[PDB]
Amino acid sequence: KKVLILMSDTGGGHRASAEAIRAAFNQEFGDEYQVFITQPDIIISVHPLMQHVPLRVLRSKGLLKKIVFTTVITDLSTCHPTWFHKLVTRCYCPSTEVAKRAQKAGLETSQIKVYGLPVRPSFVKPVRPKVELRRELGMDENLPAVLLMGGGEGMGPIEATARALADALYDKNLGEAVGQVLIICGRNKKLQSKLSSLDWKIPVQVKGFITKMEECMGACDCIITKAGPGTIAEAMIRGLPIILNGYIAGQEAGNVPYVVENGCGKFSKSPKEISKIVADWFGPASKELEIMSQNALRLAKPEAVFKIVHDMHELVRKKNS
Numbered sequence: 001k002k003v004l005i006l007m008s009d010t011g012g013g014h015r016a017s018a019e020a021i022r023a024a025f026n027q028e029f030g031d032e033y034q035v036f037i038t039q040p041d042i043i044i045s046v047h048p049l050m051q052h053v054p055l056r057v058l059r060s061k062g063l064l065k066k067i068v069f070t071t072v073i074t075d076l077s078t079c080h081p082t083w084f085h086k087l088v089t090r091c092y093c094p095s096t097e098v099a100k101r102a103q104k105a106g107l108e109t110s111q112i113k114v115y116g117l118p119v120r121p122s123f124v125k126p127v128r129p130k131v132e133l134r135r136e137l138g139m140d141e142n143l144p145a146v147l148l149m150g151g152g153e154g155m156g157p158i159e160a161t162a163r164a165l166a167d168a169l170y171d172k173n174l175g176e177a178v179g180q181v182l183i184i185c186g187r188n189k190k191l192q193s194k195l196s197s198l199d200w201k202i203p204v205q206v207k208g209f210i211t212k213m214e215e216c217m218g219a220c221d222c223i224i225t226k227a228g229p230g231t232i233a234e235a236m237i238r239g240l241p242i243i244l245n246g247y248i249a250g251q252e253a254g255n256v257p258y259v260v261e262n263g264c265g266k267f268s269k270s271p272k273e274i275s276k277i278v279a280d281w282f283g284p285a286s287k288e289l290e291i292m293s294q295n296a297l298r299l300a301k302p303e304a305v306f307k308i309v310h311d312m313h314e315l316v317r318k319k320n321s
């Protein structure tokens with residue numbers, strides 16, 4: 001069968017969700033399905049402006065009742081109404097906040113699923129011990145660790161934040177580090193070389209593009225990142241309290257309250273203030289860190305992508321009769 005995913009690569013994709021879904025198909029139903037990201041039986045939109053038009057194309061031909069049209073919402077809160085369309089067979093929601101929002105849009109209960117934000121199946125294989133993961137990455141085994149990243153392209157004031165962290169997580173009365181940093185620069189090669197060439201006074205590992213994010217996050221105790229939905233969902237599955245340091249205008253604004261309101265992290269654009277929060281969490285406010293970690297795990301939706309595609313399967317199995 002033919003699976004057609006569509007998405008605006010013009011930055012906001014969401015690529016991460018599209019590939020995660022494709023990965024889900026291949027791993028679950030094998031060659032039974034054949035998927036393409038961008039003659040389809042099922043059609044998936046992971047974008048807030050590829051609903052109406054792509055739908056009118058199926059209404060003004062009558063190919064609607066033929067092929068299924070779903071939607072995987074990627075904002076986590078305070079969405080843009082354009083995700084919601086009555087002519088949608090199913091609208092997958094990453095949270096109750098959004099589901100209850102879809103209800104207001106007038107989407108019937110049979111049109112709404114709340115499985116969570118789809119994360120790579122390759123991510124969701126379960127936890128390895130923290131000591132082992134750290135050893136594999138060349139990190140110190142015992143020091144609490146903050147993961148610092150900025151999506152696939154390594155955006156954000158990463159260097160300034162790393163510097164602030166280096167000064168903030170060094171105890172000058174024992175003359176040693178009380179914390180450590182794992183930096184993932186993604187595809188930002190320029191940043192990777194800059195950071196790698198500097199001497200850091202606490203343990204700092206600089207990586208480029210990571211494919212086994214699950215392990216990197218598993219090695220750490222909290223995370224600093226821009227408010228990307230994919231990273232947020234991944235961090236919560238790994239019980240990582242989140243310090244959001246900013247967001248891409250329009251695309252990622254609604255994700256901030258989802259983290260803060262649910263007790264899963266904090267927001268701050270100041271490298272210095274961020275480093276203060278981490279030193280606090282790694283020191284006198286460790287209790288708070290654990291509580292936020294627990295909050296994150298309770299909201300984590302590791303099986304999201306599986307439930308979504310299976311529901312997509314049971315859908316095509318019944319539209320072709």
Ligand SMILES: O=c1ccn([C@@H]2O[C@H](COP(=O)(O)OP(=O)(O)O)[C@@H](O)[C@H]2O)c(=O)[nH]1
Pocket residue numbers: 013014015016151152153184185186187208209210211213227228229230231232234
């Ligand atoms: O070195 C890297 C950097 C990023 N990512 C992945 O890239 C995705 C980024 O998605 P997000 O929604 O957080 O950022 P956006 O797609 O909006 O740029 C996440 O799933 C990360 O796990 C990765 O696998 N390795």
